[PDB]
């Protein structure tokens, strides 16, 4: 390509058919290249055979995410502001049931807008702003309206840094191809200087402006816009102005104190969102580390070190090419970023970190399943992109004889095991349930697997739960309750509208879901593991790195020779994970409502959204639609003519879109060709078709329009199924 250059046009390329592999989009017309162009639009086997740029693009086309997450948030802060309900909800929590969005009464619309709290028509929320927002050491609607434009500021600017890259004549190699410092910085002072900084604006301002909110008032009968400077006088109620101490150290006297923190654990009676008196200390006690920690270092050295006998000789030298990969140092990350998201999903529901959550049921489970699909949707990826490594990234083979060349050495092996693992599971991990049916429908309970028939006896208790809620008696200092109230030992009194967390008991019907997870988590990974491992060569095809990591299927021979590849192992690996997460969700809420969520009154006689129906009745896998799907969902199929209605009214579409995927999943290809011409014929008679040769779907595009649909179908189905059984009773 010209047009023409090198050097010697500014005149930009708008006009002249094509670009992207060289007997390119050819003069001669076609359609396939219009899904080409969008797909693989980002890729790197083309653009140039030379690293250089690519990192100079990804550090820019990156940017436009932050900026975006930044245009987003703004319409959420704005939204969570003038489309109010926040002002109204906060003087009045336990009571309200929040909104931010509202229609405009065009056509049918309005049904969707149904009285939500501080006196107005709207559609609800299961996205816990209104609750980060508890923070506001200040309060005010127009104020969020500054935090809002403060958002659009970071954006335009944190979006003109993206002009101020690639398009501007760019940095180069050394800049990233000296890695030497990167984490040094990152973790030290941002990971640090945020958490740190967050400390300073987490007791300064917030703690006090909810220390005396957890009582009454109406805001501006509290927390001015400046009030919190030098005036270290209201900081007087929430500890000393250090009195006689000077910059910690010890020649200090406490005859009666010990700074803010004074460590909690449990839950505010009046706002059980976990205590804040702590929340500063923990973030402070973070940062320090990061503050000390981001001070390594300059790199091989540490990895060029510990080897052994069978261990990893190539451990030593574990990648020069880890300054020369991406597709590698992205895949690693996704496993972590991803696997480090759904660890949120627990510490959240068994330890709320915001005021008013749990009581708020629906506004932190939405969460625990949204955060849950990322700690999964980012993991199969975290494999895909390793397959993208394993196939291609490096120039030649300069990488040699090491940890990997090792793992591969065995490979019909690491995956030889893992397999049997799964059929051991599955048999012990699902037909287990099927016993029950076949023998409870035969009907002889003597011999089921009930929490009571097969020998276990009115106790689960003695394991580690019961040595967690009881541990404030070790090296442990203490502080009433535990760490997470859901643990075996002691305490009850949690909240005065509805409930929050309490013990959460186990045994079987907790024993075996917990095991289906195993088998589910395991056969997921089998297919990804073997998939990324056998990326490039095999004894079904060895001539098998020769195009890319996709390729439809090699060809009718060898018997099958179809699925193979690794786009496709990252195609049938999604297919499982949709279950992996989709059944983990199914788990939590049936627990968390069967027990936990429920409610106090006199003598606090607890009354769960369901008197533990779980008991003897999830163990039957029909009980999973006797007690679940057919029981709850009665709220989705009753939901017409209401306010939420948009869920029942989705629940048919998307419970349709899924049942459209199979068409894309289950079908041939020269088929819709053979068909597309009958069409093309009738077209030509009137004189109406040929130009831009209309073509069927690109074997693997077809699979691309399976899967993606099967998910946005099979998923939102419950996104509806859910929001419709926590809004309204529960």
């Amino acid at each position: 390509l010209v047009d023409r250059d090198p050097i010697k046009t500014s005149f930009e390329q708008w006009a002249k058919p094509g670009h992207f592999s060289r007997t390119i989009a050819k003069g001669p017309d076609t359609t396939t290249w219009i899904w080409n162009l969008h797909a693989d639009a980002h890729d790197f086997d083309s653009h140039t055979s030379d690293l250089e740029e690519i990192s100079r693009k990804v550090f820019s086309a990156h940017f436009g995410q932050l900026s975006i997450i930044f245009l987003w948030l703004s319409g959420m802060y704005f939204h969570g502001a003038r489309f109010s309900n926040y002002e109204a909800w906060l003087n009045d929590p336990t009571h309200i049931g929040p909104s931010a969005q509202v229609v405009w009464p065009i056509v049918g619309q309005e049904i969707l807008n149904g009285d939500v709290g501080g006196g107005f028509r709207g559609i609800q929320i299961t996205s816990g702003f209104f609750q980060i927002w508890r923070a506001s050491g200040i309060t005010s609607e127009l104020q969020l309206y500054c935090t809002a434009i403060g958002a659009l500021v970071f954006a335009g600017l944190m979006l003109f840094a993206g002009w101020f890259h690639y398009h501007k004549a760019a940095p180069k190699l050394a800049w990233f191809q000296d890695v030497e410092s990167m984490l040094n910085h990152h973790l030290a002072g941002l990971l640090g200087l945020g958490s740190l900084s967050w400390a300073r604006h987490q007791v300064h301002v917030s703690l006090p402006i909810n220390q005396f909110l957890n009582a009454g008032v109406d805001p501006k009968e509290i927390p001015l816009p400046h009030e919190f400077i030098l005036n270290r006088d209201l900081l007087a109620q929430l500890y000393p102005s250090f009195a006689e101490g000077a910059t910690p150290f010890f020649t200090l006297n406490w005859s009666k104190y010990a700074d803010f923190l004074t460590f909690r654990g449990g839950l505010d009676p009046l706002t059980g969102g976990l205590w804040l008196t702590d929340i500063a200390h923990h973030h402070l006690a973070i940062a320090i580390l990061f503050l000390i920690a981001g001070h390594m270092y300059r790199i091989k050295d540490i990895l060029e070190a510990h080897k052994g006998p069978f261990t990893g000789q190539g451990h030593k030298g574990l990648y020069e090419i880890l300054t020369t990969s991406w597709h590698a140092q992205l895949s690693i990350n996704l496993a972590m970023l991803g696997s480090l998201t759904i660890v949120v999903a627990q510490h959240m529901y068994s330890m709320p970190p915001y005021p008013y959550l749990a009581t708020d049921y629906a506004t932190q489970l939405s969460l625990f399943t949204h955060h849950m699909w990322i700690g999964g949707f980012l993991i199969v990826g975290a494999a895909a992109h390793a397959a993208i490594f394993m196939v291609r990234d490096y120039d030649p083979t300069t990488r040699y004889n090491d940890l990997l060349d090792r793992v591969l050495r065995h490979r019909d092996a690491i995956i030889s095991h893992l397999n049997w693992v799964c059929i051991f599971l599955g048999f012990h991990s699902f037909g287990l349930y099927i016993h029950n049916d076949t023998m409870s429908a035969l009907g002889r309970p003597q011999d089921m697997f009930s929490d009571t028939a097969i020998q276990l006896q009115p106790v689960f208790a003695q394991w580690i739960q019961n040595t967690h809620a009881l541990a404030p008696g070790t090296t442990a200092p203490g502080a009433t309750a535990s760490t997470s109230l859901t643990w075996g030992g002691g305490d009850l009194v949690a909240v005065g509208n509805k409930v929050a967390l309490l013990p959460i008991p186990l045994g079987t019907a907790d024993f075996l879901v917990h095991h289906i997870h195993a088998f589910t988590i395991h056969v997921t990974v089998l297919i990804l593991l073997k998939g990324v491992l056998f990326a490039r060569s095999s004894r079904l095809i060895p001539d098998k790195a020769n195009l890319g990591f996709r390729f439809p299927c090699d060809g009718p021979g060898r018997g099958g020779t179809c699925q193979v590849s690794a786009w496709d192992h990252v195609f049938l690996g999604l297919f499982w994970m949709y279950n992996s997460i989709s059944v983990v969700i199914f788990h939590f809420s049936w627990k968390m409502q069967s027990d936990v969520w429920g409610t106090i009154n006199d003598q606090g006689v607890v009354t769960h959204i369901t008197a533990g129906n779980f008991a003897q009745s999830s163990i039957t896998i029909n009980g999973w639609l006797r007690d679940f799907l057919w029981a709850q969902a009665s709220q989705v199929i009753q939901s017409y003519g209401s306010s939420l209605s948009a869920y029942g009214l989705f629940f048919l579409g998307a419970h349709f879109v899924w049942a459209f995927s199979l068409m894309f999943l289950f079908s041939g290809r020269g088929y819709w060709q053979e068909l597309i011409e009958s069409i093309v014929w009738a077209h030509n008679k009137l004189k109406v078709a040929p130009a831009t040769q209309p073509r069927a779907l690109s074997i693997v595009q077809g699979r691309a329009v399976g899967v993606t649909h099967y998910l946005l179908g099979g998923i939102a189905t419950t996104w509806a199924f859910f929001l419709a059984r926590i809004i309204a009773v529960g």
Partner: protein, 84 residues
């Protein structure tokens, strides 16, 4: 000032405790593991004299030497030494 002035000098009791016990512990480095109580390099009693740890970790007690009694159960007896 205040007692925090006798504590202004106590910046020394940590920072000089730290940094004066600094250089030696990183000085003949490029070393990693190892010392005398292991693999070949050799002589005993065990001993005796080799710094940072010994002297300054003893100085935290030392800061409580002369300010002792004066801060404690305030003043007693008729000159504990007997001399004028």
């Amino acid at each position: 000032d205040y007692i925090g002035s006798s504590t202004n000098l106590i910046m020394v009791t940590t920072t000089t405790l730290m940094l004066f016990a600094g250089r030696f512990g990183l000085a003949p480095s490029a070393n990693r593991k190892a010392t005398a109580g292991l693999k070949l390099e050799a002589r005993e009693s065990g001993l005796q004299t080799g710094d940072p740890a010994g002297f300054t970790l003893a100085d935290t007690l030392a800061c409580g030497a002369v300010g002792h009694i004066m801060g404690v159960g305030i003043v007693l007896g008729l000159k504990n030494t007997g001399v004028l």
